[PDB]
Design a protein around this ligand. Structure first.
Ligand code: DJ3
Ligand code: YB
Ligand code: YB
Ligand code: ZN
Length: 607
């Protein structure tokens, strides 16, 4: 199998075993400058050259054995960047190693990085930098085999201005005054667990920390530290549960970093330092499933890794499956089923958005000539979860299936695998139930578009109240509007309010008078919970309420989580009254946006 997203030599030719990164962060030039020393191991005889991935990097020189060697940058291939061929001065035989030290500088427009001016931060006095390498942006930081089929260890030394803090996806190895420049500090990092390069991460800013667990500090700007320490207090209890499900946590520390609002994702499971959106700071811990998700990647994704992005569902399906077991052990099995059924609803939404014949609704996808950022959706998460939940029910329940999950993690730890590796092992583990497994419509589940061929069984206990109320609103006539009342919500959790809105939004538009009555009785405008507010504002805009336009524009621009920003801009563009202001607002903000978000919103808006 080929990694169609990488231009570098494949793992069948050579493999990077280690990276030693020494670099310096320059906020005036918006550059990372330094050297990347790659220890590469040949997999064949007579290896005299190799190719690495790069994207908008300037190469100063390549040094092998103290001497500068020949190298060439090829033509750029759009989102994949430019291949970099390096001439080896010695021909390598099988399993021989060499160290290649590349001197590089990043472009200020690096798609892996967002550079924030002080005005874009909470404190307003210091700038800020953060990276996002998944899926294929590590090449926009440093030259590498930018494929998850290769795993390497790394150590890093990072020079920054002394009033700023640097963190990486690794164990902190101390800080010292920069010897060459007195005003800069050097932060050291060591990652002894082999990782794919998409898990390399860097942040630099005016960061403070608070300890919330024996192996967990929360990091953020001072303005958010207190709120963050409260919101994520459950982290250690989730880690303990995750260890019961997946086996030992091998990474040492589990720190959390709360990023600026422009962070594009809800979470990123960078090893030793999960990144999360500040839109999780709801004030009541109600969005902690995101933490459970990122914790679970410490097994499914970071330890057992998809060999190419075509098999991304392995990473996300299993992680959602573990996530929902963590929340089930914390809050009960009825809650696990509630979240599982909500996930099916999100799968319905994604299939409707793409269309039921669209190739991105397949579980195993073909990313040939497809930018992974453009294909990204909830399909791998929720179709993958649905497959595992269906299998759980088919094979005798959660205790039995969790036994498989732990064996799977143990079998493929530190490796990169394909859907066939997973399925072959499922059949090996469940030897005594092969007849049961052969009842699965594997072709449909793995390779057909649209909704899965069978829907799992879901407990309805907590969902029933959401259905009742959404149906009341969907079918309401004029003589029902006065009977709605704030008491309709008295026995609904925030999770049930969110699912009520999700169910109602599936049937939007509602009549405008109905939405106005909904605000009158429920005061959803006052809710700051980002998930609820998102769905509420989508419902209002899709239902043509002009008063919601400024609220939706504000939410779309004051944070940058793509889950929220992209649909809010798309809804505003589809509403005739807000279309021009949506486009103008995007044009005015795009220079200050995260580069990937700016690209995707521009595509969405057809600018
Ligand atoms: C669907 C085919 C595309 C293959 C992967 C392509 C792009 C993915 C790029 C970055 C992914 C970062 C994922 C971090 C943790 O699972 C994410 C939870 C946050 C998700 C959200 O707010 O929707
Ligand atoms: Yb320069
Ligand atoms: Yb096979
Ligand atoms: Zn994930």
């Amino acid at each position: 199998i080929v990694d169609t997203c990488s231009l570098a030599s494949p793992a069948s030719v050579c493999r990077t075993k280690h990276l030693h990164l020494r670099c310096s962060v320059d906020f005036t030039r918006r550059t990372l400058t330094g050297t990347a020393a790659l220890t590469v191991q040949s997999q064949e005889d007579n290896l005299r050259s190799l190719v690495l991935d790069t994207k908008d990097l300037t190469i100063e020189k390549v040094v092998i054995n103290g001497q500068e060697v020949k190298y060439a940058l090829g033509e750029r291939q759009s989102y994949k960047g430019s291949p970099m061929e390096i001439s080896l001065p010695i021909a390598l035989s099988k399993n021989q190693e060499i160290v290649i030290e590349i001197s590089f500088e990043t472009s200020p427009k690096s798609s892996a990085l967002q550079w924030l001016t002080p005005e874009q931060t909470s404190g307003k006095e210091h700038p800020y930098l953060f990276s996002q390498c998944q899926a294929i942006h590590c090449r926009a930081i440093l030259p590498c085999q930018d494929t998850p089929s290769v795993k390497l260890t790394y150590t890093a030394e990072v020079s920054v201005p002394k009033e700023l803090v640097a963190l990486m996806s690794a164990i902190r190895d101390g800080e010292t005054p920069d010897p060459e420049d007195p005003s800069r500090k050097i932060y050291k990092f060591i990652q002894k667990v082999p990782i794919p390069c998409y898990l390399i991460a860097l942040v630099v800013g005016a960061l403070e920390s608070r300890q919330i667990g024996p192996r967990t500090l929360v990091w953020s700007e001072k303005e958010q530290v207190e709120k963050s320490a409260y919101e994520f207090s459950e982290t250690e209890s989730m880690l303990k549960i995750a260890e019961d499900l997946g086996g030992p946590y091998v990474w040492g520390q589990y720190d959390l970093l709360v990023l600026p609002p422009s962070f594009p994702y809800g979470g990123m499971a960078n090893p030793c330092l999960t990144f999360v959106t500040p839109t999780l700071l709801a004030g009541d811990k109600s969005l902690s499933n995101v933490i459970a998700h990122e914790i679970s990647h410490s097994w499914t994704g970071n330890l057992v890794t998809n060999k190419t992005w075509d098999h991304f569902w392995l990473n996300e399906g299993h992680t959602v499956y573990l996530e929902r077991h963590i929340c089930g052990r914390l809050f009960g099995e009825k809650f696990r089923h509630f979240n599982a059924l909500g996930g099916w609803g999100e799968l319905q939404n994604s299939v409707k958005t793409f269309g039921e014949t669209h190739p991105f609704t397949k579980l195993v996808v073909d990313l040939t000539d497809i930018d992974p950022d453009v294909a990204y959706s909830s399909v791998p998460y929720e179709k993958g979860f649905a497959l595992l939940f269906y299998l759980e029910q088919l094979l005798g329940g959660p205790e039995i299936f969790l036994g498989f999950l732990k064996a799977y993690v143990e079998k493929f730890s530190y490796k990169s695998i394909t859907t066939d590796d997973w399925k072959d092992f499922l059949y090996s583990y469940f030897k005594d139930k092969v007849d049961v497994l052969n009842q699965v419509d594997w072709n449909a589940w793995l390779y057909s578009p649209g909704l899965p061929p069978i829907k799992p069984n879901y407990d309805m206990t907590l969902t029933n109240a959401c259905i009742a109320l959404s149906q009341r609103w969907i079918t309401a006539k004029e003589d029902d509007l006065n009977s709605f009342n704030a008491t309709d919500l008295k026995d609904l959790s925030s999770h049930q309010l969110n699912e009520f809105l999700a169910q109602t939004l599936q049937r939007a538009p509602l009549p405008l008078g109905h939405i106005k009555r909904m605000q009158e009785v429920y005061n959803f405008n006052a809710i700051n919970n980002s998930e609820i507010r998102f769905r509420w504002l989508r419902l209002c805009i899709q239902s043509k309420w002009e008063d919601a336009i400024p609220l939706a524009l504000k939410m779309a621009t004051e944070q940058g989580r793509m889950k929220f920003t992209r649909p809010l801009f798309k809804d505003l563009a589809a509403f005739d009254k807000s279309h021009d202001q949506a486009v103008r607002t995007y044009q005015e903000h795009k220079a200050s946006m995260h580069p990937v978000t700016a690209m995707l919103v521009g595509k969405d808006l057809k600018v």
